[PDB]
Amino acid sequence: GRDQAGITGTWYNQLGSTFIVTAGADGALTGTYESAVGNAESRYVLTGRYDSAPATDGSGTALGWTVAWKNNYRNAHSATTWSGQYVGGAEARINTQWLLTCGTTEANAWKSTFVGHDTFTKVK
Amino acid sequence: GRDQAGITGTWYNQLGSTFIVTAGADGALTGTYESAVGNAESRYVLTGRYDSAPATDGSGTALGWTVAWKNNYRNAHSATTWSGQYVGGAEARINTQWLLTCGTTEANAWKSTFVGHDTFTKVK
Amino acid sequence: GRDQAGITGTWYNQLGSTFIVTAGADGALTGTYESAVGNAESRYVLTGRYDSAPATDGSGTALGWTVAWKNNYRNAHSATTWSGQYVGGAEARINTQWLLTCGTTEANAWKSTFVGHDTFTKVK
Amino acid sequence: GRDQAGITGTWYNQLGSTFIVTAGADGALTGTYESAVGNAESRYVLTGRYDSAPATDGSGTALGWTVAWKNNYRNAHSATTWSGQYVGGAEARINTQWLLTCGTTEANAWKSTFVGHDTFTKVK
Ligand SMILES: O=C(CCCC[C@@H]1SC[C@@H]2NC(=O)N[C@@H]21)NCCCN(CCc1ccccn1)CCc1ccccn1
Ligand SMILES: O=C(CCCC[C@@H]1SC[C@@H]2NC(=O)N[C@@H]21)NCCCN(CCc1ccccn1)CCc1ccccn1
Ligand SMILES: O=C(CCCC[C@@H]1SC[C@@H]2NC(=O)N[C@@H]21)NCCCN(CCc1ccccn1)CCc1ccccn1
Ligand SMILES: O=C(CCCC[C@@H]1SC[C@@H]2NC(=O)N[C@@H]21)NCCCN(CCc1ccccn1)CCc1ccccn1
Ligand SMILES: [Cu+2]
Ligand SMILES: [Cu+2]
Ligand SMILES: [Cu+2]
Ligand SMILES: [Cu+2]
Ligand SMILES: [Cu+2]
Ligand SMILES: [Cu+2]
Ligand SMILES: [Cu+2]
Ligand SMILES: [Cu+2]
Numbered sequence: 428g429r430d431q432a433g434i435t436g437t438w439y440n441q442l443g444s445t446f447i448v449t450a451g452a453d454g455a456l457t458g459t460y461e462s463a464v465g466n467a468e469s470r471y472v473l474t475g476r477y478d479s480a481p482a483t484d485g486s487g488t489a490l491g492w493t494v495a496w497k498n499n500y501r502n503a504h505s506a507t508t509w510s511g512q513y514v515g516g517a518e519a520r521i522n523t524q525w526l527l528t529c530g531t532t533e534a535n536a537w538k539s540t541f542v543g544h545d546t547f548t549k550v551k
Numbered sequence: 552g553r554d555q556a557g558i559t560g561t562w563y564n565q566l567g568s569t570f571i572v573t574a575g576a577d578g579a580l581t582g583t584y585e586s587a588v589g590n591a592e593s594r595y596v597l598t599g600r601y602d603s604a605p606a607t608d609g610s611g612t613a614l615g616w617t618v619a620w621k622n623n624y625r626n627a628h629s630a631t632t633w634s635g636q637y638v639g640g641a642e643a644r645i646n647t648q649w650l651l652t653c654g655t656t657e658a659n660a661w662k663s664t665f666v667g668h669d670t671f672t673k674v675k
Numbered sequence: 676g677r678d679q680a681g682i683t684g685t686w687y688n689q690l691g692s693t694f695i696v697t698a699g700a701d702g703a704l705t706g707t708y709e710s711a712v713g714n715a716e717s718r719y720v721l722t723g724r725y726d727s728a729p730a731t732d733g734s735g736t737a738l739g740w741t742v743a744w745k746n747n748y749r750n751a752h753s754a755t756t757w758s759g760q761y762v763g764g765a766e767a768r769i770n771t772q773w774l775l776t777c778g779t780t781e782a783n784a785w786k787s788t789f790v791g792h793d794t795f796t797k798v799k
Numbered sequence: 800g801r802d803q804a805g806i807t808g809t810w811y812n813q814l815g816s817t818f819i820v821t822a823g824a825d826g827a828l829t830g831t832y833e834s835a836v837g838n839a840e841s842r843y844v845l846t847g848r849y850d851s852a853p854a855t856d857g858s859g860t861a862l863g864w865t866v867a868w869k870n871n872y873r874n875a876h877s878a879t880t881w882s883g884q885y886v887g888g889a890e891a892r893i894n895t896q897w898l899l900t901c902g903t904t905e906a907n908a909w910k911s912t913f914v915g916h917d918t919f920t921k922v923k
Contacts, residue, residue, distance in 0.1 A: 724867035
């Protein structure tokens with residue numbers, strides 16, 4: 428993958444969450460996510476995909492991943508997907524927007540989904 | 552997984568896209584996605600996660616998955632994440648919202664992400 | 676406005692909410708919104724804008740509006756914006772996606788915004 | 800309005816766009832928007848609403864507004880709604896997420912809406 432080395436490693440967002448990911452040559456993303464906020468403790472499994480043959484015109488590398496918020500400690504009956512792009516360089520970044528859906532009854536489904544945006548850096 | 556059997560199988564959305572998924576006992580989602588629209592042809596790898604121990608109060612089961620839009624035929628330099636919940640019953644549904652991020656230059660990053668909503672059913 | 680007559684009137688969404696709007700020749704939208712769900716009762720002021728000279732190629736008419744959820748009865752310290760398009764015809768529709776932001780502390784701002792989608796029809 | 804004075808004035812986002820707004824005592828927002836990017840030139844009418852009696856616990860003030868991208872110079876057949884909160888203090892901010900819907904045919908409606916996030920400050 429073009430940015431396999433760039434993406435693999437430990438990333439941190441503006442909330443202090445820790446995103447540990449391995450990018451595979453086939454376009455796979457695997458790793459763990461630890462949220463500094465919310466109904467969460469310790470690490471959760473994540474899995475996703477990235478464009479392993481991105482454009483060479485300076486564009487970023489599109490990618491996404493999911494965490495379901497169940498582990499051996501807690502279950503928040505919810506999942507978040509981050510959709511974004513990796514931007515290489517001296518200050519590499521993964522810029523994302525995300526959707527956090529909670530399991531609800533049908534009557535509460537209108538209020539089932541939060542939206543936000545996280546920026547991940549290699550430092551902090 | 553509580554809804555492992557309910558989720559596993561072939562699903563179709565309102566656009567005619569085909570979502571083929573296997574839910575693992577560990578919370579994994581694997582399979583393929585074929586979009587009826589956009590810069591896409593044939594099947595693409597997907598991976599995601601679901602809550603394998605959902606609440607028993609009638610709430611849905613939270614889940615998400617990602618497709619990076621590269622396969623052996625095309626590369627649209629983009630990825631979509633769907634975030635949603637599975638609702639069991641006679642007319643089972645996966646109700647989602649999604650984020651499609653395209654790789655862009657930094658100057659175009661403000662217009663990098665589409666948002667929408669797909670409903671998947673076992674029929675059609 | 677091309678769709679001034681089409682847009683003006685009373686609309687209803689899938690939740691049973693009532694959207695009463697007047698489209699002005701200048702592109703203004705004014706009216707009231709009554710939500711069937713949430714921390715809301717009775718009517719709330721809304722204001723927005725629409726494209727008063729849409730394309731003539733069959734495309735919909737882009738529009739948006741805001742409700743702040745304060746009236747003489749309640750204040751939910753939140754606002755929703757709907758962004759969408761009006762589609763004319765025998766079964767006219769306003770198809771929207773929306774963002775509901777609640778006032779939060781800075782520590783809770785990551786969970787300040789819900790996202791959803793409402794479809795409005797002239798009937799129901 | 801509690802933050803009538805705080806909100807009224809000229810704001811700038813991270814793209815260099817200019818948001819000129821007057822907050823009314825009744826909860827109204829009026830003004831003009833000039834986008835530094837996209838199919839836009841000069842000023843466009845905006846209108847919205849804000850919570851004129853926010854909580855006093857340190858929470859932000861919820862607000863939203865709409866721009867339809869038609870003026871005397873251009874018509875981009877689209878509208879954006881920003882939904883967010885005003886945060887007062889020495890470095891006052893309006894933190895938003897937004898939805899930009901373009902008029903499309905029904906066949907293209909799945910790709911009608913962009914999502915993003917803008918932060919507005921009194922400086923820059
Ligand atoms: O927090 C969680 C799990 C952790 C989520 C962390 C987020 S991921 C995006 C962001 N980037 C990041 O690094 N960290 C955060 N999931 C919601 C848990 C539902 N709550 C009750 C059910 C409900 C249904 C509908 C609407 C509201 N609630 C439980 C308490 C809670 C916690 C957090 C937010 C809201 N409610
Ligand atoms: O289509 C794709 C891949 C297929 C996406 C299918 C979507 S998933 C959500 C939904 N549910 C579903 O079942 N099917 C659809 N990815 C965009 C491809 C970018 N275009 C140029 C780059 C660009 C950058 C910024 C803004 C706009 N464009 C290429 C042509 C194209 C195709 C579709 C939409 C827009 N542009
Ligand atoms: O309901 C409201 C006002 C009514 C909103 C109705 C929505 S508009 C989109 C949709 N289409 C429609 O026709 N009707 C609905 N506003 C949230 C009120 C905040 N709650 C505590 C604060 C908070 C902060 C952060 C995260 C969660 N909460 C009060 C109780 C409540 C009510 C509804 C949902 C959630 N919480
Ligand atoms: O730009 C505009 C008007 C200006 C929008 C500026 C945005 S507001 C959010 C953000 N904060 C800000 O300060 N500034 C930006 N509106 C789209 C115009 C549609 N294009 C073809 C139709 C189409 C339909 C579906 C999908 C894609 N396109 C015309 C060319 C264009 C311009 C910009 C982005 C994309 N396409
Ligand atoms: Cu290419
Ligand atoms: Cu909650
Ligand atoms: Cu439980
Ligand atoms: Cu495109
Ligand atoms: Cu035109
Ligand atoms: Cu609430
Ligand atoms: Cu109060
Ligand atoms: Cu365009």
